[PDB]
A paper describes a structure:
We herein identified the product of the Hc napA gene that we named Cinaedi Atherosclerosis Inflammatory Protein (CAIP), a 200 kDa major antigen of the immune response of Hc-infected individuals with atherosclerosis. DNA-binding proteins from starved cells (Dps) are a group of bacterial miniferritins with a nearly spherical dodecameric structure. With this study we have identified the protein encoded by the napA (IN ITALIC FONT) gene as a novel Hc antigen, which we named Cinaedi Atherosclerosis Inflammatory Protein (CAIP), that possesses a strong immuno-modulatory activity. Collectively, our data suggest that CAIP might be one of the bacterial factors that contribute to the pathogenesis of atherosclerosis associated to Hc infection and that preventing and eradicating the bacterial infection could reduce the incidence of atherosclerosis.
We next crystalized CAIP and characterized its structure. CAIP presents the classical quaternary organization of all the other members of the Dps-like family: a dodecameric shell of over 90 Å in diameter, formed by the twelve subunits arranged with a 32 symmetry. CAIP monomer displays the classical fold of Dps from E. coli, the structural prototype of the family, namely a four-helix bundle, where the second α-helix is connected to the third one through a long stretch of 25 residues; in the middle of the latter a short α-helix is present. Inside the nearly spherical shell formed by the twelve subunits there is an internal cavity of over 40 Å in diameter, where in the other Dps-like proteins iron is stored. As in all the members of the Dps-like family, 12 iron binding sites are present in the putative ferroxidases centres, as detailed in Supplementary Information. The superposition of the equivalent Cα‘s of CAIP to HP-NAP38 indicates that the two proteins are very similar. However, CAIP is very close to HP-NAP produced by H. pylori, as the two proteins have 79% of homology and 58% of identity. CAIP possesses a dodecameric structure similar to that of the other members of the Dps-like family, key factors involved in the protection of prokaryotic cells from oxidative damage, and in particular to that of HP-NAP, a major antigen produced by H. pylori, whose impact on the function of immune cells is well documented. However, the two proteins have an overall identity of 58% and possess a different charge distribution on the surface, which may account for their different properties. In fact, while the exposure of human monocytes to HP-NAP leads to their maturation towards dendritic cells, CAIP-treated monocytes become macrophages and internalize LDL, thereby transforming into foam cells.
Numbering used by the authors:
A (entry chain H), B (entry chain K), C (entry chain G), D (entry chain D), E (entry chain F), F (entry chain E), ...: 1 to 143
Write the structure that this text describes.
């Protein structure tokens, strides 16, 4: 269902938001500043995903998550408790999460288009395009 | 301790951040728009408290929270699971949490100044003043 | 026909454009300024719908309406002769016309896609999303 | 009467506003782009005259027209059913209507100064100068 | 005399300037923020009226008031000594003072044109229109 | 005739335009830079009356001057063949010419209002006001 | 395949990019400035098509063209060896090339949607809409 | 008491606010324009002190002055009834009043810090520093 | 001599400045607005050549012209007494004068480099380049 | 010949423009992002060189290349057929191409000054300096 | 005395200012560009420190250093006579000097508060926080 | 030698940079504020020559001065030990040093042109012109 897929993204966005803050704070090594800058941009864009996806559930007449307790249980992304990272561990860590979200937004688009919900479908397709490009930049950067 | 007071603000900030999104999404009534805008300014300003205090913990040579699991357990702020709000009851809920944060930052200033950490105290004093101004506006609006 | 749906939207837009000027001028009560501001943004956005929809008719090789007499006869939105309004009256009036526009744009999108006209469908899908969002906000404000 | 003249300008502006969209959409020939841009600048200026005179009627304590049906009966300016124009027709059509608006605004200034309504006369004199300038520019372009 | 009207407007501006600060500080109730923000706009506009009229007296060759003691003695606007207001009280008080200013500026325009001082008359006609627009909005807001 | 008054201003503007350049280039003494900056502002503003005044003559259906030979003959402003100036000499010179233009714009406004030419008169009343303010400031500076 | 259509657009874009520079340099006649300004915006837009289209090939895991030699052998758009043009046959030339790109992007969208590549299709639908708008405007100018 | 120091600053600010207007209007001599611009920025900055200090009293739970009658009787800054000044007397008058304000803000910082009111003390320390910078600059200019 | 050439450039600039105003006011035909706006930019750029050249003569330790009487007798550009122009004739008039200024500036550069005056030569070389670009564009539009 | 050197730079710029696109797309390794940004700006300055030199050829009365077939025949920059690069590789490749362009522009400057074509020499001297700065920075980066 | 400590900071600031220019010019290695940009911001911010401290000395009624000869003597920042550095080397040098400025600013704050000079202490505390944040970032980059 | 003249300019720029801060801090008298600001603009411009000139040495393959100890021994501009200046003394201190820099940049241009180093000569000629203009202004101000 379109709504249930939206709430999965919502719960995963809020966990990824914090996970990316940890990368932002605890990155080590010579390119500390560029990764410090980039991670901050990532969690700001997923703060926007967090809000948009939730408000879209509201426009569709349902209830998004409103507690971190429920978002933690619902989330399929794993929290990161370690507190020191080099730049390429973070690129690898973010790349895997991008591929999970890409699968998630690809399903939302296919499912919304089958229900004739082209608005939810259009939103997913733009995020699909944004992720495919970021993914290709990371696989090139880790090459 | 300065660090353990900062980490409390950190945990409560992240819970307050989500609670205010719920007010943002689920406010009803004639004053839907100003409340929808005010709440958004608030969670953007507490996203900044969340990051500032965490990095200040980092500059003092200790570790902040890096997982939502730890932040929920540490947060004294109560999550709000109900999902429909009148405007006045958002002003009251927000006023009460502001008074909790005000008490926390005032102790942070007193504790940091004890220890000669005037930087942490200066930061806390700014938020004390910002909270005192906002708390006084809410009291006038609810009067 | 895609063109007939576009031209219906054009005629209803031009009638809605004037009606909202009336709400803009004749709102009474303590919410005068917020309503006076919001109505003006509404008619400026429908001035743009009026113009976009007309030239899309021309890019498809047909003629849009060019006279007020033809648009008044074709419009299903009805004019408002009352010259004094309460603020919740205006929100209710605007909510109803939006749902009419939402249905008009959904049919334009569905019909345009069925003919392989993905450009017209894409334009309509943008307006469906904007109308779905505003309707949720208007329903929340009257709740 | 000042209000009668203002409400006459109101109706004729609404008719001219749509007529200039027709010129805007259906100009043909080599000077298409400059004419396409000039016509759009003209209907945006008359959207502003439309709102200004209507609001001026209200601050003088009376009611302007609020329906397109009422403005078409009051409008002295002919609607235009033709659907294709060369660039010199449009400059001729616009010049003819500008001279009509000039007489109308000159009468408003004279009547308003009779009644000691100097703010209404001042607004009218500003539009008289704007019309006298554009009229002189159109005569040079047609010379 | 033109300068006596300017100096009277000058004195009444200075008292109204402080009075509006009192409304700005002590408004209570749910419409706190819009009134808090409108009142500040108002007292900055009368700060500029205070300076404009004073400097115009100087261009006409006499002296404006230069002490608060004389401004209180000369003013006809009355000071507000209570320290708590709801939003509708403030609106009714500003409307009453605006109508007083509108007569002062209308008389200034009338007298200045009778003497051939068209510059002073034009300045007053500008303030007359601003008051007439603001008055209409307040009457609508209290309706 | 308003035209003959306008063209007189035209001729005097262009002569004063060059005279002010001489003050700009050849000011001596410690106030070099404020006077150097002020004279440039002055001649840029009179380049503007030069063009505005000619275009109005054209909108009234007559011809302005089109050669320096004709303007130099028509001009009453005297040219300055001295090539070195003290800062107060410049202030004195500008003040004398400003009172000449003020007389000219007052007579232009008086005459245009006699014939019902409110546009030309409104243009002149603004220049009367700008000169009265500038004249006052110059008198204070030389006082 | 989507990729081989994307790469075809890439090759034709680079030839069209240089062809429009030739028009940009060698247009003659009284309309020199607008077409000179117009062509520069066209080749700046196809530089952007050139880069967008190639990067999408990479996000799809393939290689775009990387040499001018390969793109020349692949482009179907004809090079222009003539070295002097009037304004109308530049418009006819751009109109003909726009209709070729339009078919290409329409094919690209149809193939992308067939395979479930909604991102590539969304990009193509944008270019289809922009070409349809420009084609309509070119036909009006050549009418 | 901190509020008693705040309310004294408020009363003296409003009196000083007007006195500087008198300096602004009636400065004579060669340095007219720099002093005119300087006094305007001084009185606009004390208008801001006036409002800040008053709002601080309200956040501390007390009432500031709300009438010019009370502020005149509380003020210690003497009003200036003279209407003509050279530039150097204005600098002397402003220098004397600045050291009076400096002593007031210094006492305010001392009392607020002794009572643990770090917020009002921080505000006072900022004005103390700004007054010291302005005091030093004025002493150099009068040297 | 460099000063000789600079003062000749000075005199011809001031006459051309007014001539281009005549073209600006008195162009007729369907290209009125492009020619109206283009001619204005020309005279604003020569107003600056006028000032640059005069100030450079001053830096070289001699005196520029300071009266229109002196510049009129020195100028070689001829004044234009006709008061009605077609677009093509304005272009040809401007092209002929541009080739004169180009000559003049090429002689200034060559002469300045002889005596080692690289600054004057560098300014001249920039004007040579700007005129060569403009001359080629004018020849293309006249082809 | 100045023109033959300009046309050579033109032909090499067009090949270098594409080569740098290949570097832009296919850079791999840790330093993916900065190189992706750097290569894109590089090709944007050479798009500007491409247009400037061609327009300078036209100002000299000769014809630039207008065909990709002729430019690749004339170009001496080797095309790059590889599709995978680390950042150091790209730096060494660009450095070699910069040193070639540097000899082209120094020879261009030397020839133009020989013939008295100081405009072409100054354009070349600016490009020589820009290349010398970038060459120094690349040698520093490869050190 | 706070003044000696301000003057020590002044002398070290000017020596640090030049040393950072040296790092700015002579960094080598694949990380030239980020370091070149970062060093330029450091020396511009220490130019601001150089000026603030000197002006703070003067407001305290003392004299700062005014010659490089005296500042070289007093400075404890060591000059660097090497002309080639890798990036890690520069970060080490900058981190060591930042801990020196941090110590230096901490004593300034403590001693200024001892004398009730809260203005000097507040300025120093701002610098302590800026240095603590930058030091944390440099330690992470060298980690 | 070009490099030898460049590093001489570098050393004198760094000494002049500090001397002008001394003028900036220790100016006294009524004309305090313009002089405080002009000196600030001057030392910021010589900070730019300091960096430009050092970087030009580097791209010519040499090392500039890198320590204040070396720059002090190379500088010919004398340091200033006095600590108080009137504005007329500063104006001629600056004029004398400007005449020195003018000679230095002039000889740099001549030497660089002798070596075919036209980039260094163009930069020097730009500084020669900027100095020639300022020297003309200071002489007029001291006249
Ligand atoms: Fe939101
Ligand atoms: Fe952060
Ligand atoms: Fe349009
Ligand atoms: Fe309105
Ligand atoms: Fe003022
Ligand atoms: Fe004009
Ligand atoms: Fe790209
Ligand atoms: Fe306030
Ligand atoms: Fe100038
Ligand atoms: Fe170009
Ligand atoms: Fe400073
Ligand atoms: Fe640099």
């Amino acid at each position: 269902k379109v709504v249930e897929l939206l709430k999965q993204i919502q719960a995963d966005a809020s966990v990824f938001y914090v996970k990316v803050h940890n990368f932002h704070w605890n990155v080590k090594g010579m390119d500390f500043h560029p990764t410090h800058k980039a991670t901050q941009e990532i969690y700001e864009q997923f703060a926007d995903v967090f809000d948009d996806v939730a408000e879209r559930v509201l426009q569709l007449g349902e209830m998004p998550y409103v507690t971190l307790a429920d978002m933690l249980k619902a989330a399929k992304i794993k929290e990161e408790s370690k507190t020191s990272f080099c730049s390429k561990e973070i690129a690898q860590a973010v790349l895997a999460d991008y591929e999970y979200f890409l699968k998630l937004f690809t399903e939302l688009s296919a499912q919304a288009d089958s229900q004739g919900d082209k608005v939810s479908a259009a939103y997913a397709d733009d995020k699909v395009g944004e992720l495919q490009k970021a993914i290709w930049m990371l696989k090139s950067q880790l090459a």
